[PDB]
Symmetry: D2
Subunit: 111 residues, 4 copies
Amino acid sequence: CPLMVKVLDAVRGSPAINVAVHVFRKAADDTWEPFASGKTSESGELHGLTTEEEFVEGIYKVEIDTKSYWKALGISPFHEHAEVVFTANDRRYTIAALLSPYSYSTTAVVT
Amino acid sequence: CPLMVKVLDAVRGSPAINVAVHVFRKAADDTWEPFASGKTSESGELHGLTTEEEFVEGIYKVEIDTKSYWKALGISPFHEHAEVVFTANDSGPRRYTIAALLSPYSYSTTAVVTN
Amino acid sequence: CPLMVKVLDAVRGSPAINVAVHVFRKAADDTWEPFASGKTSESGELHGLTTEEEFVEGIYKVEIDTKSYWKALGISPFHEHAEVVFTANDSGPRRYTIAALLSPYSYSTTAVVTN
Amino acid sequence: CPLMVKVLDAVRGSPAINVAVHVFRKAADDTWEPFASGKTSESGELHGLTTEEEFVEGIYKVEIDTKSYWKALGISPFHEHAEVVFTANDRRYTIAALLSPYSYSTTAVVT
Ligand SMILES: O=C(O)c1ccccc1Nc1cc(Cl)c(O)c(Cl)c1
Ligand SMILES: O=C(O)c1ccccc1Nc1cc(Cl)c(O)c(Cl)c1
């Protein structure tokens, strides 16, 4: 598991559960090609997106579907989605995000 | 000025100066059309991106060029950009300030929206 | 104004208005002596806490009364306060802006320090 | 384990390892009484601070020794320490912090 995504909720003080996450890899013609996707678990985590063989160097985008998350909770949000764009460089990447209705924090833990 | 961007540096404790910012707007055909661009001043602020007339309803993407910022400082950072995507003006005109606080492997972003 | 505090609300996307702020300075005997206090304006800013003369070197604690803020809004939050503790003016006078971005169970804080 | 502390480093993209953490509980005369302490592990986490029997309702302060962390890395920091003050209310509390030299983010995950 070279890539993990973890999402937290700063309003409820909880994991952000059942958040849709879409990963894309940038193609040679600069378009974004679907790569992997899933929904966060009860712990706010999404494991199993990819494998070491399939996760080659390149630019990736992780699109967290925050708008739908907030609406399912009855809350009015600002962003369409949170976006995390980075280069994978030859390590286990954890992309974390801490969500509020009008704000988000994101970090990477690369170990 | 209905759209302002402010960027801060969490390593130095300072405005993030000379940060390039590109704004896009989603077109009818669902592509990201160029909308405006500029770079932050010595206060970390970027004013003058657009006008009340040109800033219509739509889905906007504010792309803050954080990798280019850190690289100009001699630092290899994690993210390519910070990308702030939001629907604007769908209840009438509003004024938006998009703020970001930058570190090499992390950022925060918020919005202040006023009527 | 060598010390300014700015507070934003990450739920509403707005300044955090009417936030009480208490500043303390560590005394010789290691207790926290009162130094200044005030509350944020309609822009989320608090100016006028102290003067160049009174703002000497020392260890300062800026206590932002976030629980009192959220409770006044009818919300039960996690933290009692946000507490920003730092050495000031130890290389000569500087100007400090302490900023905070508030959510019910979380906050961020940064400093902008200028000469 | 009713209380866990996790600390991350936003400069290096890593857990913040060997950070000293001191917990205090507010006493009846409003002083802060030492309660528990430890150092974060290789994962940035500090487990085993207290037990359910010893962690009663009250106001607690978690003081993360960020200044010494940054100095051991050769970096010049702003804060003396990060402070997280909260009421425990009768759940497993995780206090997380994301550190930069001039800034920190903190959240609670209460599950
Ligand atoms: O908004 C300002 O004018 C500002 C001025 C100084 C420092 C920060 C500022 N904003 C800000 C933005 C984020 Cl994203 C954040 O996390 C925190 Cl704590 C603050
Ligand atoms: O909580 C975790 O396990 C975690 C794991 C890896 C990276 C970050 C983590 N949490 C976290 C905490 C804060 Cl204060 C924050 O702002 C952001 Cl974005 C994330």
